[PDB]
Design a protein around this ligand. Sequence first.
Ligand SMILES: [Cl-]
Ligand SMILES: [Cl-]
Length: 94
Amino acid sequence: TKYDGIDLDEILKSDRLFNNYFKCLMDEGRCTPDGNELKKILPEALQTNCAKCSEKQRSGAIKVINYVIENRKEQWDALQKKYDPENLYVEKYR
Ligand SMILES: [Cl-]
Ligand SMILES: [Cl-]
């Protein structure tokens, strides 16, 4: 439920907090430790429904992904194009 010591829900609801992670994912800024872990698992999160991830990993990633699809739509388009070009998460797992 937390990334880098902050409640994930507070990160997602704050442009200031979320943009650090967004930029990390888009190779536009340095990653925090959990930002980096998210980056490593995000292709598997979207394309396989985090088949090989841990429970902690899966919970965090699915929370981020679904908040982003619902309420950060421009950032979703960018993340989807890079990490899930075939749109498997929306078509298979959402
Ligand atoms: Cl941590
Ligand atoms: Cl943490």
